Amino acid sequence: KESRAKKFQRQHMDSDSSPSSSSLYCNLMMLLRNMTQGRCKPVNTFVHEPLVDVQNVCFQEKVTCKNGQGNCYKSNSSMHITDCRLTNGSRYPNCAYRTSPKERHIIVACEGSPYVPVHFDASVEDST
Ligand SMILES: [Cl-]
Ligand SMILES: [Cl-]
Ligand SMILES: [Cl-]
Ligand SMILES: [Cl-]
Ligand SMILES: [Cl-]
Ligand SMILES: [Cl-]
């Protein structure tokens, strides 16, 4: 059983690994984080920063969520992330992923007390 904040950490936090993800990173991480259980999660972003730095985004720039609902926030700084995208050829339970490391501002939806990330909304290159 899992809280929204915990699900966010499981799906999106990778604090203790290198930023420049190897080509196998997504294959391994999507498996290890249970995102290939039941189905291949089609796309997923991991954030290679300290948990506190990501949580602090909840107190940074308030921006509109992609679906116009909830409370989203954009990081002041560009963060190390990795996008994982399910390969066209993959079919569950064979879940293969292309790994794309980049540095981007993250946009997360925050909620609760404490007020913490519960949804990875988007990433964008530009500051402001
Ligand atoms: Cl950084
Ligand atoms: Cl990508
Ligand atoms: Cl792509
Ligand atoms: Cl999410
Ligand atoms: Cl972008
Ligand atoms: Cl883009």
Using the structure block, give the residue that is written with the tokens 């913490």. 116
Whose tokens are 């190390």? That residue is 80
CB environment 64-80: b (16+ within 10 A), e (fewer): ebeeeeebbbbbeebbb
Residues in the annotated binding site for substrate: 7, 10, 41-45, 66, 85
Ligand 1 centroid, distance to 80 Cα (angstroms): 5
Q: What is the resolution of this structure in A?
A: 1.7
Residues marked active site are found at 12, 119
* Method in brief: X-ray
Q: Which domains can be identified in the chain, with CATH numbers?
A: 1-128 (3.10.130.10)
CB 127 within 8 A of CB 119: no
Q: How far is the CA of 123 from the centre of ligand 6 (A)?
A: 8
User: Which ligand lies nearest to the CA atom of residue 46 in the structure?
Assistant: 4
Closest ligand to the CA of 121:
4
Interstrand relation of 43-47 and 72-74 (parallel, antiparallel or unpaired)? unpaired
